[PDB]
Amino acid sequence: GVQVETISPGDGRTFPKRGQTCVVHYTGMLEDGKKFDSSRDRNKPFKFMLGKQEVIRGWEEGVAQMSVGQRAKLTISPDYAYGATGHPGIIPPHATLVFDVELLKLE
Ligand SMILES: Cc1ccc(S(=O)(=O)N2CCSC[C@H]2C(=O)N[C@@H](CC(C)C)C(=O)O)cc1
C-alpha cells in the first residue's frame, strides 16, 4: 500500500475533493534513497486530478490524505506503483518508491 509521514504540516483543513486538481512539487526516490525524477528540477509543479488515474495508486491514496501546505513522505509498495514491470529507463521492476510530496494548492 502507501504510508504517509508528514515532513511539514499543512493547514489540516483543506483536503482535495474527488476530481479536484492537485498542484504539487515532488521528488521520487528508489529504495536506496537516490532521486529518479523531481518536478523541482524543472522549477515547475506537476498537476493531476485526484482519482482520474493520471498517477499511480500510491499517489491517488496518499495525496487524498494531505492538506494544502503539507509536505510528506509517501512510501509506496510496488503493486501501488509500477509492479513487476517497473517503468523502462527510470524505475526498475519490483521497486518500492519513496516520494517527498508537497501539496501546494488545490484548484
Ligand atoms: C517516465 C516516468 C517519470 C516519472 C514517474 S514518477 O515521478 O514516478 N511519477 C510522476 C509524478 S506522479 C507520481 C508518478 C506517476 O504516477 N506518473 C504518471 C505519469 C508519468 C509516467 C509521466 C503515471 O504512472 O502514469 C514515473 C514515470
Swiss-Prot record:
The gene is FKBP1A. This is Peptidyl-prolyl cis-trans isomerase FKBP1A. It catalyses: [protein]-peptidylproline (omega=180) = [protein]-peptidylproline (omega=0). Inhibited by both FK506 and rapamycin. It is a peripheral membrane protein. Its EC number is 5.2.1.8. The modification N6-succinyllysine is found at K52. One of its GO terms (cellular component) is membrane. Gene3D superfamilies: 3.10.50.40.
